[PDB]
Amino acid sequence: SFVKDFKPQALGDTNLFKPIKIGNNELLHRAVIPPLTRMRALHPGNIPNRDWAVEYYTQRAQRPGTMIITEGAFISPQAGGYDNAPGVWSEEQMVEWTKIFNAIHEKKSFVWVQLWVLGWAAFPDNLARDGLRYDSASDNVFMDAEQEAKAKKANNPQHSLTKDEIKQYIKEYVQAAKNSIAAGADGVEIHSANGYLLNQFLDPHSNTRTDEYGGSIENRARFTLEVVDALVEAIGHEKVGLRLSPYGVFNSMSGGAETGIVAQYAYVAGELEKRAKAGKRLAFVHLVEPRVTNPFLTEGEGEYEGGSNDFVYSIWKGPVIRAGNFALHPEVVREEVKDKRTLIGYGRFFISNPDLVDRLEKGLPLNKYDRDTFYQMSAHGYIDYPTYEEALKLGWDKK
Amino acid sequence: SFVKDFKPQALGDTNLFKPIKIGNNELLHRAVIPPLTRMRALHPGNIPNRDWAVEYYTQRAQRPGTMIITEGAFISPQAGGYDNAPGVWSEEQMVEWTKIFNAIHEKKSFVWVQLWVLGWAAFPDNLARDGLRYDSASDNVFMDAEQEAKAKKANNPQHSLTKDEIKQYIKEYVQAAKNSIAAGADGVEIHSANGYLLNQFLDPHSNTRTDEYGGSIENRARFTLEVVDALVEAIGHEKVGLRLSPYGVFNSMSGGAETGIVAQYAYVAGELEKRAKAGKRLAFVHLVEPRVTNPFLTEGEGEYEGGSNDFVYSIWKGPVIRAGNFALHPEVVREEVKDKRTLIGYGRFFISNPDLVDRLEKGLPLNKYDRDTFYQMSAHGYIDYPTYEEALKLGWDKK
Lengths: 399, 399
Ligand SMILES: Cc1cc2nc3c(=O)[nH]c(=O)nc-3n(C[C@H](O)[C@H](O)[C@H](O)COP(=O)(O)O)c2cc1C
Ligand SMILES: Cc1cc2nc3c(=O)[nH]c(=O)nc-3n(C[C@H](O)[C@H](O)[C@H](O)COP(=O)(O)O)c2cc1C
Ligand SMILES: O=C1CCC=C1CO
Ligand SMILES: O=C1CCC=C1CO
Ligand SMILES: [Mg+2]
Ligand SMILES: [Mg+2]
Fold this sequence. Notes:
Two copies of one chain form a homodimer.
Chain A: E1 20-22, E2 25-27, E3 31-32, H1 53-60, E4 67-69, E5 73-74, H2 91-106, E6 110-116, H3 124-129, E7 134-136, H4 145-153, E8 158-160, H5 163-182, E9 187-191, H6 197-202, H7 217-220, H8 222-235, E10 240-244, H9 261-277, E11 284-288, H10 311-315, E12 320-323, H11 330-336, E13 342-345, H12 348-352, H13 356-362, H14 388-393
Parallel strand pairs in A: 3-13, 4-6, 5-6, 6-9, 7-8, 9-10, 10-11, 11-12, 12-13
Antiparallel strand pairs in A: 1-2
Helix pairs in contact in A: 1-2, 5-8
The complex binds flavin mononucleotide (2 copies), 2-(hydroxymethyl)cyclopent-2-en-1-one (3RN) (2 copies) and magnesium ion (2 copies).
């Protein structure tokens, strides 16, 4: 059924429907599909779903000129820890990704692979089973007691990365990005947000290191910028984006409670602009808004009102993708896209509306999403959400 | 005469005329007199003008409940270098300051002493004459070639402060603040803005040190926060404010050209909020707007459009005084004071309008200022600017 109390507003008369170039891609509108983990990848081997993934991405690429960022993809087994998320390290995986990229391109849309490393958000028992470390920035602070428990139970205690193991990750990032481009992706997005490994280095709560990767703003940012630099070198700045969530508390990050948090993220932004003036401007910076500090809370919950992402705009002068509770708030989007370098990521509603761009353009009702099938091993709640046309035929307007 | 093309707007219906408590002072409106150097202090001894200073401050205290921040005052001879700016280190000086504070208090207004240390903006020849160092953060970078010349000529080359000399300044800040309070001031403002000594430590262009006072965001901020801490300890957090100019280029600071500049200032703001949650919240943070990057350029010139001070609001949760080209833009002030903790500093127009608050309240014409007498040794352009009543009597409406 449709979202019951929603008062849609057509956005076709706004900059949301003005074309923009991001990296090498000529977007025809600025509604972006942000990275959305769906847990349909098959085990063993973290293989993109051979039955459903192509169709899923095809449906969502249906509006020509759409920028799609994939679900997080592990760069290596050690970077993983969820059996049903995809990876981009093996030939098996890339064969399925190539089919996906081809289908999106045939719909005249674009695809960026999000490169994902879990750190302490990984399941230590899964890792222990596969002979892998349970990794984070530090070893004296844990995500929650449960995760700290599972580690000890699985005899896989949280391990503070040595400098050589960090380098190994950087090498894996490099190879995963090369794999992505070679298989046909338009670019990659470095996931440095939402409390995953890179974020665990950025945040002073999770990073209590005293070597050059912790103890200061510059140090905590080091790992992230090294990945950025390694990837810009490997496949070019025009094929690299960065995702950040300055106010996020997901996976036990500090958010606005940390008084130094804006300074931490402002520094990263500064360093990106620095590289941009020196000839190497990233394709985009992708920001999670304080509008959503946890995307598994219903829209309007977990909103942080004490901080704004606007600071990034004073520092980084390139494209900015903003994501978080925008689908139900076209009145907000209308204002934000008045800025000419701002794009809008729509997450949960792109899950449930394959034709979302049309619906935004024309102010059509939205399909409700089903949180129960966000992470299910099923076609249901994945590829069976109807377009508006199909929804009408199913009588959804009269439910 | 009156400002010719100005279209005044009454502001009495805005928060500019709502009372607010700053430190121990109950302000009755939020139009603040920012620090304004006028060079009427007498030489020798940097003594507040015995003929004119009381009358000057009296005229400008005339609206009850007005917060006045004094012209910059040197904390020590070594901190000085302009013969006609006042100091707050000697008994001679404090006797004149006491008369000033008394007169302001009799008008039911308030007075905060700005504590000033010149660093490389000082005249090295004046200092050499008095046997004093020409001080800055570093010795391999100079304000301009002229100042670098005068130093060498006066055999007083720019001197990079040792850690002991920095401590000596901190001691002088402490004593100057104690002197101010003892003489009757409501508080002090630490001048960490506009390219003076503390700013020279904050800015990566002027600070090329490799010890703990330079080389990183935290290090460059060290001197400023030490002063803050020493003064909060000495006279209380409710009697201490801080002035900053994140986008300023005055006296050869970097401004927005430096990609790390927001991060530098965000860190300072964070540290202040940190102390604020730990029980020691400064009375206010005072910000120079990118609206004015140089107050000796006419209004509208030297405006930086690539950056905003709004970031401070996501980090510091206390009162914020904002200054820069607000007098001729009531349409801007109307919006900014909708924030309930925002005050507006009016500089050049408080120079030329002793009754400025009334004129803002009622939307009256403004007296033009005379830049030629900003720094003159004269009553003219100091205490002879007319109130609106006097201006009418002089026929200023018919000029
Ligand atoms: C089911 C689900 C899976 C997600 N997976 C990812 C992910 O893999 N990588 C990522 O950076 N963000 C992920 N997110 C966060 C979203 O990209 C987005 O920031 C969030 O949903 C807020 O946007 P929205 O209000 O439009 O849904 C996910 C969110 C949801 C609800
Ligand atoms: C003549 C003059 C003297 C000033 N003296 C000081 C000073 O001693 N300390 C300080 O922090 N700012 C000083 N300033 C900067 C002002 O406080 C203020 O930030 C600036 O004038 C911008 O505000 P406005 O546009 O309202 O004039 C001075 C400005 C002028 C024009
Ligand atoms: O970032 C991710 C990956 C899976 C869920 C989230 C939350 O945003
Ligand atoms: O800061 C000061 C002191 C004298 C002039 C300025 C410019 O703002
Ligand atoms: Mg029907
Ligand atoms: Mg008349």
